Design a protein around this ligand. Structure first.
Ligand SMILES: CN(c1c(NCCCn2cc(CN)nn2)n(Cc2ccccc2)c(=O)[nH]c1=O)S(=O)(=O)c1ccccc1
Ligand SMILES: CN(c1c(NCCCn2cc(CN)nn2)n(Cc2ccccc2)c(=O)[nH]c1=O)S(=O)(=O)c1ccccc1
Ligand SMILES: CN(c1c(NCCCn2cc(CN)nn2)n(Cc2ccccc2)c(=O)[nH]c1=O)S(=O)(=O)c1ccccc1
Ligand SMILES: CN(c1c(NCCCn2cc(CN)nn2)n(Cc2ccccc2)c(=O)[nH]c1=O)S(=O)(=O)c1ccccc1
Ligand SMILES: [Cl-]
Ligand SMILES: [Cl-]
Ligand SMILES: [Cl-]
Ligand SMILES: [Cl-]
Ligand SMILES: [Cl-]
Ligand SMILES: [Cl-]
Lengths: 289, 289, 289, 289
């Protein structure tokens, strides 16, 4: 059993004034709230028990959007981050939720797309000891956790936002952990409690799997107003080309058989007037390979 | 002249993007949607403004904008329990309007262009009857449509006609004399109190001024996920080209001399880390024609 | 041995006046000529001997861009289509070029992206008898050749631009053929000589492989001014995110070991001032997984 | 006043996109780039226009535009053997200019906004000295930069200064009296004949008019792959919103009464199948204010 955490603790003042009224992870990417994308990621990894961590202020808005998850065959719980004291704090806040189980942490503002993404998630989820992370070639590795590889393609170092990156390989905001993570997190000293320190702890124990997320995958940037807009245009282009949605949670739950035709039809009813509800209706009758 | 921004529900049209929060709190590029119509009223020289929103979202608008005193405005708030037409704004706003002239702007309407201040000025100076703006669009059937005679006189208004008489849509910006509240009270639901019925009342009295908003102005659509995205790209292109912002309320208040250098500097302080605060700081030292 | 054909015969007057001065397939998609994308596709399928079919007018422009291909470890030949009399005409024009070999036809305006695209091409290229095509879920199947599947997922019919498509599965502009194709093409009667008639001929002989190109692949539309612009924005988003190019022929030739470090350095020299040349230089020193 | 469009080489800056054909023949959305500056000269009331291009591309410009008689223009052509500065336009154009007033526009400059015809009109009516336009940009170091004194008088011009005195760039639109050819003949290479040197010559004689092009105008960048794409999206957003075209030369000629209904109908005929021809047909019957 692997449990999911979505860290949706806003973005401080970075995207103000756009994010003054509402948390970053409730802003739409094209046609759906940002959080639908990482939620859909956990769902594709087969995870149904998910903790959403947000600000005290925005927890009710996340709860109004997503409920307890029962409508999508999920169990959603909620926890608050009073102060953004690092990503690794997710494991202390989430300690009781995690218990003795395996976990996956996804950032609430990370968008993924591509062929065999389910297999890339599957390989990390099946490793039931140590930690699994993904390395993706980016233009601006200095913004991220950077992985250095030896001539043999083995991961040998992790640096958080290095001014002189050793590679162009950034660690994506998707992390798989065994039962050691909470204890590793409790022993961290502030630099913020750094996720890169958690990942370096596993690396030093020789228990960090670093899989390449290939250039054929899109790992999208929602860090700036410019990149948020590009992410919107990217999803819009795919969806209007295909007549298929990216990270429609109702669709993923239906295809995982976590909800049946009758439940999906009920979810379509109140959205029947717009394209999203019409999309859910079409899913009941169409064969999609 | 007193201002009203109608920032009510779009029902379920943009769901699930708008499930968590009102359309008019979503960003267009770098700032909340409501900054654009607010900036429009400010450019028309209006400082006393009623913001009408859903019962749920009124506190979010209040948290974003306060009483307006920081921007040299007087902001008041009212709720629209149910979206029963745009004309309801004048009943909700009746006590706020009192015996004064008024301007209604829709909370999801974006305007841009040269001498926009003069186009607003001409409508605002006409102290009797009503002034509206007609703009050539591809899809007039979505709007209030103006029909003109061979002499270019306005002779009919139709709300979302199946067979539009012209390609000229009425924009979501309306100037009214002291007759508007009484005209609104006498309206019967169509099940909505139609702004087009208010405007037809003035037309039949021969007291409706219909000024052409030329093709050299951008009147932008935020009605669909596609058009919301285009509006973001449109503002981003102008702002990144110019190093100047469209509809920055702090800037407009400063340039109208509604706040001084000292007040603007104080507003910059809490945003000093991001581009928006840095922009407000640059405004103190730079000459912009 | 499999030989490649790129059909780049313009677009008649469909995209006029944009295409009045130059052929569609010489228009850029972001940073590189459209034809670089299908050329890169054939190169990824391991094809080095490629016939480019274009108008008499534009052949010299294609020749000025691409030469004989020797700089990229290719052998490029050129043939003219006097009149656009259907896609299947490619096999009559290309008859002597093809000889007794296997072939692949790609449309000069088709863009592909995704993970394991090389494997999808590999599976079609290794089938040395019959024909292989790809089916992709689209919004507007009525614009394309449409594949109908039985309950078992076997292809049972092909229709060219049906007013009432049997599925949302369009045949992409990428076709693999055995030595039968030229003879099948010679026996066709005008409806234009239809590629769908060629593919139906193989289906009726039970020699048509239809592989699904999954929703995790991008098959992009360059049919309209709107879709051409979206294709540009799509590539720009991926390339600026990754610091890696999509369909850089110099890169693909280098990674296939069709050219060495010394040849790549020579190709970089005349482009050294711009980002494209700087990209080719960085390829000499960087490990990319 | 006679017009010159300088549509010469951008060297290798946009290679390989511009390897096959000149920048100014690439489309911006739905029409060749050169349609935009041509439309600019036409809006300034200029019918006699010299098009300067590379030796290679002159025939392509001639094939696109002819002698202009179909649009009520007189188009002549000249070649720039080597891109040795913008001021060379006046030596190449010397015989074409003769004893007349002139306007130079860059072939890759796009303008949009309300009363643009009046901004052009004011410069065109000044029959002595030179008129240029100053526009606030983020990156003034890329352009000719105007410095103003406390009174808003222009006091210096610098070409691509490392330390810009202001954020005010000179746009690629220049109005000149009969002095310009002689001023140009006396210029020494910097290794380019600089337009900024021509403009500084007029400034030192106190005969340079520098009018502000306000933030309500769009002056668009086609200097980079990124900015070319944004220009396309910008025009597409306006045209799809309005159902009206920006810089349709047939429309501008018709509205200036340089061609009649019968001539416009003939121009529509060969384009009748696509949206551009259908647009020209609609212009014959529709009243547009
Ligand atoms: C485009 N993708 C995607 C989808 N593509 C995944 C196809 C590959 N696949 C097969 C299976 C069978 N277990 N699971 N995944 N699917 C299909 C799906 C099929 C079966 C179960 C779940 C989802 C989907 O419904 N929505 C999707 O959005 S994706 O790149 O894998 C993705 C992207 C972002 C979030 C979640 C999934
Ligand atoms: C780009 N525009 C605009 C601005 N352009 C307006 C320039 C025309 N103008 C001159 C004056 C001088 N009294 N007022 N307006 N200005 C300048 C401004 C100067 C003085 C007072 C108010 C605003 C501004 O600060 N922000 C702006 O966003 S705009 O197209 O007219 C506009 C569009 C939508 C909302 C608000 C403004
Ligand atoms: C993003 N892709 C892509 C690339 N991705 C392909 C990676 C998968 N792969 C491994 C191999 C080893 N034979 N070949 N392909 N590669 C890498 C590459 C590696 C080895 C050989 C050729 C190209 C590349 O250089 N340019 C690319 O543009 S892609 O989706 O397969 C592609 C898209 C469009 C045209 C050609 C390829
Ligand atoms: C949107 N603009 C524009 C147009 N807008 C200009 C309207 C202002 N105007 C009124 C008049 C009446 N003599 N002339 N100009 N017009 C209208 C027009 C009407 C009469 C004569 C010429 C053009 C047009 O046909 N195409 C246009 O593209 S524009 O911003 O001024 C422009 C920008 C760049 C090139 C050419 C025009
Ligand atoms: Cl890949
Ligand atoms: Cl106008
Ligand atoms: Cl700034
Ligand atoms: Cl897939
Ligand atoms: Cl202005
Ligand atoms: Cl039309």
């Amino acid at each position: 059993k692997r449990k999911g955490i979505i860290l949706a603790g806003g973005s401080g003042t970075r995207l103000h004034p756009a994010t003054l009224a509402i948390s970053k992870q409730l802003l739409p990417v094209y046609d759906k709230p940002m959080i639908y994308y990482p939620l859909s990621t956990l769902m594709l990894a087969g995870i149904r028990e998910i903790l959403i961590i947000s600000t005290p202020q925005d927890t009710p808005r996340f709860q109004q959007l997503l409920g307890d998850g029962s409508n999508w065959g999920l169990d959603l719980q909620y926890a608050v981050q009073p102060s953004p004291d690092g990503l690794a704090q997710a494991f202390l806040i989430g300690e009781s939720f995690i218990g003795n189980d395996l976990s996956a942490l996804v950032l609430g503002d990370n968008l993924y797309y591509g062929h065999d993404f389910h297999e890339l998630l599957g390989s990390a989820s099946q490793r039931q000891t140590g930690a699994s992370v993904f390395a993706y070639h980016v233009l601006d590795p200095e913004r991220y956790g950077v992985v250095e590889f030896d001539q043999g393609g083995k991961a040998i170092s992790l640096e958080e936002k290095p001014l002189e990156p050793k590679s162009n390989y950034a660690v994506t905001g998707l992390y798989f952990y065994d039962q050691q993570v909470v204890d590793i997190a409790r022993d961290l000293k502030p630099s913020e409690l750094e996720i890169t320190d958690v990942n370096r702890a596993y690396l030093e124990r020789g228990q960090l799997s670093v899989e390449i997320m290939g250039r054929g995958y899109a790992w999208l940037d929602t860090g700036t107003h410019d990149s948020l807009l590009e992410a919107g245009q990217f999803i819009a282009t795919l969806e209007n080309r295909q007549g298929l949605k990216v990270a429609c949670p109702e669709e993923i739950a239906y295809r995982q058989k976590w909800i049946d035709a009758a439940q999906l039809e009920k979810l379509a009813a109140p959205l029947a007037k717009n394209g999203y509800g019409q999309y859910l209706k079409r899913l009941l009758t169409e064969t999609v390979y």
